[PDB]
C-alpha cells in the first residue's frame, strides 16, 4: 500500500514541475494508471496538473450582520435574493 511504489513522480504540464503523490491530488495521481483485464496498468501518457495549478473559485455573499464573508452553501436562497443577505446563523441571532 506504499512500500516503495509511492516514490512515483508525475510531471506537470502546467508549471513543468515534477512532484510526488504529495503535490499531486489522489484523483489526478490515480490517472497515472488504469484497470485492464482486472490488472493494474500504467497509463502511456497521463495528463494531469498540480493542485495549485488547477483553478479554484466559489461564489459567496457578503453579510452585514457579522461583517464576514460566507459561501452560498450556508446561505439561504432567499437570503441571496434580498438586498441585505444575512447568514443563516445571523438571522437566528437577530431574531429577524
Ligand atoms: Zn503545475
Ligand atoms: Zn453574518
Curated annotation (Swiss-Prot):
It comes from the Eukaryota. It comes from Schizosaccharomyces pombe (strain 972 / ATCC 24843). It is found in: Nucleus, Nucleolus. The lineage of its organism: Eukaryota, Fungi, Dikarya, Ascomycota, Taphrinomycotina. Required for meiotic chromosome segregation. This is Meiotic chromosome segregation protein P8B7.28c.
Amino acid at each position: 500500500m506504499g512500500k516503495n511504489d509511492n516514490d512515483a513522480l508525475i510531471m506537470c504540464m502546467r508549471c513543468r514541475k515534477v512532484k510526488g503523490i504529495d503535490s499531486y491530488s489522489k484523483t489526478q495521481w490515480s490517472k497515472t494508471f488504469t484497470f485492464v483485464r482486472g490488472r493494474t496498468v500504467s497509463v502511456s501518457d497521463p495528463k494531469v496538473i498540480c493542485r495549485t495549478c488547477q483553478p479554484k473559485q466559489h461564489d459567496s455573499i457578503w453579510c452585514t450582520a457579522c461583517q464576514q464573508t460566507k459561501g452560498i452553501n450556508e446561505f439561504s436562497k432567499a437570503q441571496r435574493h434580498v438586498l441585505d443577505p444575512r447568514c443563516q446563523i445571523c438571522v437566528h441571532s437577530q431574531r429577524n
